[PDB]
Each structure stands twice: as C-alpha cells, then as structure tokens.
Amino acid sequence: MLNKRKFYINGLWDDPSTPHDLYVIDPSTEEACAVISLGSTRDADKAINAAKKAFQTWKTTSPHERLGFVEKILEIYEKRSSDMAKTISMEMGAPIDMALNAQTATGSSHIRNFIKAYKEFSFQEALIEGNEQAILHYDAIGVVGLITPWNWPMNQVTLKVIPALLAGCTMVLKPSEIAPLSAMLFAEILDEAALPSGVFNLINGDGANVGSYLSAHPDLEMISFTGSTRAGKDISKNASNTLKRVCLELGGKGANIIFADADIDALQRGVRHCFYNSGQSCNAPTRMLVEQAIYDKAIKTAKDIAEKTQVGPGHQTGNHIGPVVSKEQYDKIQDLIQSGIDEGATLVTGGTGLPMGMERGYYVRPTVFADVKPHMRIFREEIFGPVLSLLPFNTEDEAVTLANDTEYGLTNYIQSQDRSKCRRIAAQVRSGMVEVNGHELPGGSYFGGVKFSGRAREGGLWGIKEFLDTKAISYW
Amino acid sequence: MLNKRKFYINGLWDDPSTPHDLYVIDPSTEEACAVISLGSTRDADKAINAAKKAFQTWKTTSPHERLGFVEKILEIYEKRSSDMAKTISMEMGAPIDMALNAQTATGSSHIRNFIKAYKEFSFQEALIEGNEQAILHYDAIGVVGLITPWNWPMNQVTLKVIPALLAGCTMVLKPSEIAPLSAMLFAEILDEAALPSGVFNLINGDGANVGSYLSAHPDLEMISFTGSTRAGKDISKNASNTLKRVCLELGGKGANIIFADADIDALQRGVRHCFYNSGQSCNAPTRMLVEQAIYDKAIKTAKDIAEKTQVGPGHQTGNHIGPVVSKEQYDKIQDLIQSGIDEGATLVTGGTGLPMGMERGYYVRPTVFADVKPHMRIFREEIFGPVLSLLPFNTEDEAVTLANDTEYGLTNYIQSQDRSKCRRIAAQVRSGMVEVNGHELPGGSYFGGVKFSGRAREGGLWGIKEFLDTKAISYW
Ligand code: NA
Numbered sequence: 013m014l015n016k017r018k019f020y021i022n023g024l025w026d027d028p029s030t031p032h033d034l035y036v037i038d039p040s041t042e043e044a045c046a047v048i049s050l051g052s053t054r055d056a057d058k059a060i061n062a063a064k065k066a067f068q069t070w071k072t073t074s075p076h077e078r079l080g081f082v083e084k085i086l087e088i089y090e091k092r093s094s095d096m097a098k099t100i101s102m103e104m105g106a107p108i109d110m111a112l113n114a115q116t117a118t119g120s121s122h123i124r125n126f127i128k129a130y131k132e133f134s135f136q137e138a139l140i141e142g143n144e145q146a147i148l149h150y151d152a153i154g155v156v157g158l159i160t161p162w163n164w165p166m167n168q169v170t171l172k173v174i175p176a177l178l179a180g181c182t183m184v185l186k187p188s189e190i191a192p193l194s195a196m197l198f199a200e201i202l203d204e205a206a207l208p209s210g211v212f213n214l215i216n217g218d219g220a221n222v223g224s225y226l227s228a229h230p231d232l233e234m235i236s237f238t239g240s241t242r243a244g245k246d247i248s249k250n251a252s253n254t255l256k257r258v259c260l261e262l263g264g265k266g267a268n269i270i271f272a273d274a275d276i277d278a279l280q281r282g283v284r285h286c287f288y289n290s291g292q293s294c295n296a297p298t299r300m301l302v303e304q305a306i307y308d309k310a311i312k313t314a315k316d317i318a319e320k321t322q323v324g325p326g327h328q329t330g331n332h333i334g335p336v337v338s339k340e341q342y343d344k345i346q347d348l349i350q351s352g353i354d355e356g357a358t359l360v361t362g363g364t365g366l367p368m369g370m371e372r373g374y375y376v377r378p379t380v381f382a383d384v385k386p387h388m389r390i391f392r393e394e395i396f397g398p399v400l401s402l403l404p405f406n407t408e409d410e411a412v413t414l415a416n417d418t419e420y421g422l423t424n425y426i427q428s429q430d431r432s433k434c435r436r437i438a439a440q441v442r443s444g445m446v447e448v449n450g451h452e453l454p455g456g457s458y459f460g461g462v463k464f465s466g467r468a469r470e471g472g473l474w475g476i477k478e479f480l481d482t483k484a485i486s487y488w
Numbered sequence: 489m490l491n492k493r494k495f496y497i498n499g500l501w502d503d504p505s506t507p508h509d510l511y512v513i514d515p516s517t518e519e520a521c522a523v524i525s526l527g528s529t530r531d532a533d534k535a536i537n538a539a540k541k542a543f544q545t546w547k548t549t550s551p552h553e554r555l556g557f558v559e560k561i562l563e564i565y566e567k568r569s570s571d572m573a574k575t576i577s578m579e580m581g582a583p584i585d586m587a588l589n590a591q592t593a594t595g596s597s598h599i600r601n602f603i604k605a606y607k608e609f610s611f612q613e614a615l616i617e618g619n620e621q622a623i624l625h626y627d628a629i630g631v632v633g634l635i636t637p638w639n640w641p642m643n644q645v646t647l648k649v650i651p652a653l654l655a656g657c658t659m660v661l662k663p664s665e666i667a668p669l670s671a672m673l674f675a676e677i678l679d680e681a682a683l684p685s686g687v688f689n690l691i692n693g694d695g696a697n698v699g700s701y702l703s704a705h706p707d708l709e710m711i712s713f714t715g716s717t718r719a720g721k722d723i724s725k726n727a728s729n730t731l732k733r734v735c736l737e738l739g740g741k742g743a744n745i746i747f748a749d750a751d752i753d754a755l756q757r758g759v760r761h762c763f764y765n766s767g768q769s770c771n772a773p774t775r776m777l778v779e780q781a782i783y784d785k786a787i788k789t790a791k792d793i794a795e796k797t798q799v800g801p802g803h804q805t806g807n808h809i810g811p812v813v814s815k816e817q818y819d820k821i822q823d824l825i826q827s828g829i830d831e832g833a834t835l836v837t838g839g840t841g842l843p844m845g846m847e848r849g850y851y852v853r854p855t856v857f858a859d860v861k862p863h864m865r866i867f868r869e870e871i872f873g874p875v876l877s878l879l880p881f882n883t884e885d886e887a888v889t890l891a892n893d894t895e896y897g898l899t900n901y902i903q904s905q906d907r908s909k910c911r912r913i914a915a916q917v918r919s920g921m922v923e924v925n926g927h928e929l930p931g932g933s934y935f936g937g938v939k940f941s942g943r944a945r946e947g948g949l950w951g952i953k954e955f956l957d958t959k960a961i962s963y964w
C-alpha cells in the first residue's frame with residue numbers, strides 16, 4: 013500500500029498539521045491502494061500563505077518565462093505518462109488502454125492547446141478597435157483555489173492549473189479525496205519542472221471541510237470548481253461573502269437527438285458514448301431521443317451494443333468498461349436503476365447487481381431503458397453509470413421540448429444527414445455545447461455549460477481569461 | 489403630492505396586491521413629493537410570470553426589430569428629457585442643470601453607444617478563427633432581474649434595460665425605493681414605444697423583501713445589480729442556490745495619484761470631481777494621494793475650491809452641489825466626518841452640520857481632510873458625500889501601495905505629464921478602470937470594477953454580452 017500522506021506546500025512535500033488518514037480504494041478490487049491525509053484549515057492556511065507570498069514575484073515573470081515552464085511541464089508529463097495512466101487506472105478504475113489514450117492523453121492535449129492559445133494572446137490590446145489612446149490590460153486575478161473531481165482527473169487538473177500559471181496566478185489545488193494520486197503525481201511533475209516555490213500547492217481534503225474553507229477564504233480571489241451541481245451551489249454560497257470570481261463546471265443530462273435520416277453508425281456511436289468511462293462523464297449523452305420511425309431499431313441496436321459491452325478490471329488491457337469509482341457511487345446507481353424498473357420504464361437489458369462472474373469491485377451492468385417518460389428519475393437525474401434512457405419523438409418541436417426539459421445544459425447531441433435540420437435543432441437546444449453528427453469541438457474551443465451545468469468556459473483562450481481581470485486605461 | 493402607487497406589469501399600470509405606501513422624499517426640502525407602493529412577493533410573481541410568457545415570443549424577434557424598438561425608446565426619451573431632469577432633481581436632489589446635462593444625458597449617451605455596438609455585433613460567429621465548420625452562437629440568457637439605485641438612476645437603468653432588450657431577454661426591474669420616479673417615467677417611455685406586453689416590467693419594493701426575492705427566484709436566470717457592496721454579497725448569496733449569472737456594480741474608494749509634474753489644472757479637476765453629485769458616485773476620486781513636493785499646494789487648492797463650492801436646492805439653476813439623497817445617508821456622512829475629526833485627521837475646511845443659512849434639507853458641507861492615515865475610517869469606508877481625504881507620498885511604490893490599500897477597485901486616477909510614469913503606475917494599480925490626466929474612457933468602453941467593487945462589465949458590447957449565453961456548435 014502506497015504511503016501518500018504528505019502535502020506539497022512551498023516547493024516541499026510536508027506532513028499535515030495533524031494525521032487524518034484516508035485509504036484510497038482501488039474500485040476494481042475494493043482494496044486500499046494508498047493512504048492519504050485529509051487536511052485541516054491550518055494546512056489550507058499554510059498553502060494559501062505560501063501562494064500569497066509567491067504571487068508577489070510570480071506575477072512579474074514574463075509570458076516568455078511562464079510559457080517555458082509550461083513547455084517543461086508538458087515534457088515531464090509525457091515522460092511520466094504511463095506512470096500517470098497506471099495511477100489513474102488504479103485509483104478510479106479506468107481500463108488501462110483508455111487510461112493512457114484518453115485519461116492521460118487529454119491532459120497533454122489541453123496543455124498543447126493552452127500553449128497555442130497563449131502564443132495568440134496579448135496582455136494588452138486596444139480597448140476599442142481604431143482608438144490608439146485607450147488600452148485594455150489583463151492582470152492576474154490573484155491567488156486562486158482549484159478543486160477537481162475523480163472522473164477525468166488529469167483532464168480537469170490541466171484545464172485549471174495550466175491557464176492559472178500562464179495568467180500569472182498562484183494557486184492551491186485540492187484534488188478529489190477518492191482519486192488524489194494522479195494529482196499528487198502531477199505535483200511531482202511540477203516540482204521536477206522547477207516551478208518556483210509556492211506557485212503551485214496541493215493539499216488533500218474533503219468538500220465539507222477544506223473545499224468549503226477555500227471557497228470562503230478571504231485571501232483567494234477566485235475559485236475554479238468542477239464537480240456536482242449540489243456542491244457547486246455551496247461553493248457559490250460560501251464564495252459570495254468575499255465576492256470571489258466563481259467558475260463552475262457541473263453535471264449534465266445530455267440529450268442525443270437521432271433522426272431517421274442519421275448516418276448508418278449514429279445509433280452505435282450514441283450507445284457506445286453513453287457507456288464510455290462507465291458513464292462517468294458530465295457531458296455523456298444519456299437521454300437518447302429517437303424519431304418514431306427508427307425507435308424499434310434504436311432499442312434493438314442499444315440492446316446489441318449493451319450485451320456486447322464487456323466489463324472488467326482497470327488493470328486489464330482491451331476496450332471493456334471498468335468499475336464505477338466507489339461503493340457510494342455504485343449504491344446511488346443501483347438505486348436509480350431500481351427506480352427505472354419501479355417507475356415502469358421498459359428494461360431492455362442489464363439491470364441491478366454485479367455482472368455475472370464478478371465477485372468484487374463496483375461493477376455496474378451496461379443497462380438500457382426504453383419508453384422512459386419525463387417524470388421518471390432516470391430521465392431527470394444524472395446517474396453517472398452505464399445507463400442509457402431511450403424514448404421516441406414524433407416532431408421536431410417534441411424533440412426540442414424533451415431535450416430542453418432539464419435544469420442542466422452541458423452538451424446536447426444531434427444526428428441527422430439533413431444539414432438544415434441540424435441547424436434548426438442546434439439553434440433551439442439549450443446547452444453550452446452541441447456536437448453534431450459525431451463531430452468533436454475543435455482544439456482550443458471552450459468546454460462548459462449553461463444553467464445547472466455551470467457557466468465556466470475552460471480551455472484555450474477562454475480558459476486563460478477566466479484567470480485574468482480586465483483593466484481599461486483611458487490614456488496609454 | 490404625486491400618486492404613484494401602481495406597478496407596470498404586462499403592458500399595464502396596475503395596483504399592487506396589497507397597499508404598502510411609501511413616501512418619496514424631496515431631499516432639498518424634506519417633504520414628500522410622491523407616494524409609491526412597496527411590492528410583495530405576489531407582485532413579483534406576477535411580473536415574473538408576465539416576463540416568462542413574453543419571452544417565448546420576444547426571443548424570436550429579429551435584431552432589426554429589437555434595434556427599431558431601442559431607436560424608438562431613444563426618440564421618446566429625448567422628447568421627455570426635461571420631464572426626466574425635473575423628476576431626477578426632485579427625487580434625489582440633483583441640481584437641475586446637471587440633472588439635464590449629466591443625469592439625463594448619460595442615459596441617452598448609453599442608449600446610443602448600445603446602438604453603435606449592436607450594429608457591430610453578430611449572434612453567430614466563428615468559434616476558432618479560420619475554422620469554417622464549428623460556430624459560436626449567442627442566445628438570450630432568459631428572464632432577468634434588474635435592480636438599480638438612486639444616485640445616477642437613468643445612467644444605471646439604461647445600462648441594464650437596453651442591452652437586455654437587444655439580447656432578446658425579458659425583465660423585471662425594481663428601482664430604488666428612495667428615487668423610483670425616474671424609472672417609472674422610463675416605464676412610460678417604453679410603454680409609449682409600444683414594447684410588447686411583458687417584455688419590460690417594473691415593480692417597486694425594498695432590498696430585504698423584493699430585491700432578495702428576485703435574486704432567489706427560480707424563474708430568473710440572471711440578476712444585474714448596482715448598489716452597495718454589502719447588498720451585492722447578499723444578492724450573490726441568494727442567487728447561488730439557482731446558479732444564476734450574477735453581475736454586480738458596487739462601491740469604490742478611488743485613489744487619485746497626483747504627481748508634482750501634473751498639468752496646471754490637475755488639483756482643481758480632482759477636488760471638483762470629488763464633490764460632483766455631492767460625492768454620490770461609486771467611482772469618485774475620494775483619496776487624493778499627492779507627491780510630497782506639492783502637498784501644501786494641494787491642501788491650499790482643495791481648501792479654496794471647497795470654500796468656493798456652493799450648496800443649494802435641486803430646483804435652482806447653476807453649478808452648486810445639491811443635498812445628499814436621504815436622512816439616513818446624511819446621518820452616515822455626519823458620523824464619518826465626525827470620525828475624521830476624532831481619529832486625528834487635519835480638518836482643512838467644512839465639517840459637521842448644515843451649511844450656514846440652510847434650515848432644512850440634507851445638505852452636507854464640502855469637507856476636506858489632510859494628513860489622513862490608512863487606518864482611519866475616512867480612508868477605508870465609502871462616504872458618498874462631498875468629503876475628500878488628502879495624504880502625501882514620497883515614492884512611486886508608496887503611492888501604489890496606498891492606492892491598492894483597499895478591498896475596492898472601481899476607478900483609480902493618475903495625474904502626471906510624464907507618460908512613462910503614467911504607464912508604470914497605471915499597470916500597478918488594482919482597479920477595473922484607470923483615468924489618466926482627466927481623460928474619460930471612450931464611448932462603448934465598459935464600466936466596471938474588480939474585487940469588492942464587483943466585476944460587472946456594463947456598456948457597449950461588454951454590456952450586451954452579459955445578457956447572452958454562448959453556445960459552441962461543432963458542425964454548422
Ligand atoms: Na479511489
């Protein structure tokens with residue numbers, strides 16, 4: 013079992029003020045793989061003090077020198093990529109192939125996209141096009157709090173730490189206490205990159221104590237948070253007394269609108285996307301809304317793909333899905349699956365319990381429901397397991413109404429070979445992102461939602477600017 | 489006395505659910521000039537219901553038609569400009585000349601600047617320059633809550649209602665209960681413009697009941713608030729449970745850094761700016777930091793200008809300052825003036841009590857303190873009366889330290905004929921805006937601060953975008 017009790021504060025790994033041990037569980041086995049410390053408010057004060065002190069000199073480094081640190085971080089990140097993949101796989105259950113090619117690789121892709129964006133960005137520019145007197149200046153917002161979850165850990169950590177570096181901020185990161193090891197290795201990457209003492213600090217801890225304490229701390233000027241909508245509301249409440257900037261990346265209940273004229277592979281692509289990372293993706297397309305004409309075909313295709321979707325441990329190679337991350341997550345998912353049965357949805361395949369043959373680990377069966385109705389829990393609540401809900405629609409208006417019947421609005425999805433129809437529907441759905449016909453958003457695009465999904469705009473230029481204040485100077 | 493008890497809801501002036509009378513006081517006389525109703529949560533629900541219903545059709549109007557309404561609003565606004573000036577003068581005490589040429593005229597200037605900005609704006613554009621596949625879409629954020637204060641009423645109302653119109657939002661405005669009449673006339677302007685029923689709604693009320701209730705209401709997606717920092721924190725707290733966008737324009741404690749090499753008129757300009765609108769400007773330059781070499785000259789100039797600054801009623805023509813807006817404001821200012829004396833600052837001129845000869849009205853004497861120290865209340869707290877604080881500095885670093893010794897950061901000011909020195913200092917002061925050498929920010933620039941001054945970006949393109957969500961479509 014790994015001894016990982018220390019925090020990274022002011023350039024050094026140090027003990028917490030008081031021991032408060034927590035085992036990190038490997039969800040593929042149910043066994044402890046490491047021990048960490050849950051920090052107290054004193055450990056937070058230490059980290060924040062180190063960051064405030066560093067900021068005074070870090071804010072005066074040139075963009076050139078900051079970019080050089082980020083390039084160095086990328087170089088060491090790539091060198092440690094398979095250590096990172098194994099760590100992620102172990103702590104949160106990602107099957108090892110996808111732990112390397114998606115969990116770890118998205119980190120490197122975000123880093124590169126920040127680099128490209130930074131090269132196009134200037135800290136001064138015209139305030140009004142064609143006025144050569146007044147100027148717009150961007151300033152480091154200050155010392156910031158960063159809070160990341162367990163589901164796509166390096167995706168979420170790189171999206172926050174890199175633009176904060178480039179902006180000239182210093183920071184305290186609290187990663188997820190159920191998957192902190194990847195962040196601790198990221199800490200080692202930054203230390204090996206010789207990032208100046210106090211610029212980056214890592215303390216472990218929980219939401220109710222350390223997370224809330226950071227969000228209310230008077231020496232932080234911003235909190236960047238990725239996590240559940242429930243937690244985001246409390247972050248926002250705690251931050252309001254010091255008028256911090258609050259940037260939130262929260263949950264989703266994505267609709268995938270599939271028309272009869274969708275390309276051949278639309279249905280398969282959709283079902284596969286739902287189960288990817290065992291459904292533990294805030295933007296996963298979990299409500300499949302299918303035109304009446306191909307509804308029976310959709311059910312049949314979802315059934316086939318589900319039955320062919322293997323489940324297996326994180327440590328095994330291949331394209332099975334892994335366990336879900338925790339017992340508590342497993343229990344919530346089982347309850348929601350049972351609710352689908354009890355509320356009268358059609359159970360197409362899968363259901364409650366461990367898949368046949370698995371004796372231990374938080375393995376959830378790939379599950380499909382059909383004839384799901386808007387009032388059902390499985391329609392409304394984010395499940396975060398490999399659980400798809402299908403229902404039909406008859407008109408474009410009905411599809412849009414169903415897609416918009418949610419408080420969330422992260423990514424919605426549309427499949428149709430009719431470009432005009434794609435455009436009409438894309439304009440009417442209420443989300444921060446829309447993926448049409450399996451096309452991903454380009455590198456350097458933002459990632460973020462509207463309404464209960466949060467309104468953060470992470471990635472590329474958007475992401476760098478969340479860590480800057482603007483200043484309008486009337487004569488430069 | 490004017491009978492003004494009605495609310496403007498769904499295209500009609502109607503009675504409140506239950507009478508709750510409040511006299512509007514004319515601060516030049518201490519007498520009631522009108523009676524209004526303080527609304528309840530039921531009146532708010534009515535207004536919001538009217539707005540939600542209107543939004544369904546208002547969001548589909550073209551930009552062309554929305555601009556046509558705003559042009560019509562401007563035309564009627566200009567037609568009613570001297571009614572507006574008299575109303576503002578009466579309800580909050582602005583001397584009538586400046587009630588027309590600044591209080592009312594800034595409204596028209598903001599409207600025109602939104603018009604210009606709207607003509608440059610498009611609701612779709614490229615997501616990434618040079619990518620012709622993905623597209624950025626702007627969508628009306630939804631039904632919004634607008635809350636405005638008493639000090640620059642039409643400035644603050646036009647900054648909120650016009651960009652919300654152009655963005656395709658519907659809205660409920662609650663103006664200040666101590667200066668609501670100008671907003672009610674603005675309501676009549678919009679009604680005469682034939683703006684569709686329910687697009688714009690006005691209910692009167694207070695902060696603790698109606699203001700808080702709007703900020704927590706589940707059918708509003710955004711709150712735009714201009715007011716005190718204390719109130720902004722509570723707006724933010726109430727809004728967090730529904731994850732609304734919250735845009736805040738709060739108070740300030742502006743530093744005016746005047747070097748020995750400032751232009752001839754720098755000192756006079758500074759003192760005059762402090763007393764303008766009787767100091768009731770969130771961005772007023774209330775801390776004058778003077779290079780040691782010209783400190784005695786600064787004191788002497790401030791004294792002369794103060795002694796020559798006349799006080800008089802709102803209804804009289806001329807360039808005297810008027811009363812402050814209320815008894816409660818007057819009492820707060822007197823307390824802060826007395827604090828300056830008690831804490832040992834040098835009283836240069838003015839002080840406590842009514843100016844000689846004034847028998848009634850909330851008239852505050854133009855007051856100057858010198859040798860003010862950072863711990864003094866008059867240095868730290870926003871006074872909102874005609875009260876200037878002077879102190880010297882010896883080095884550039886000392887000036888910057890003093891200017892940044894505040895939780896506020898709205899507008900800071902720098903006077904020096906050394907352009908290099910202006911640039912160095914402008915880059916180091918921590919504010920959303922910096923006015924150098926008496927140069928105003930250009931039309932279409934934003935107005936807003938950082939930290940405890942809020943981070944709203946009102947005006948021009950910035951202001952239109954605060955009422956829009958962004959949507960990134962991967963294939964258009
Ligand atoms: Na774990």
Ligand code: NA
Nearest residue numbers: 513579666667
């Ligand atoms: Na009044």
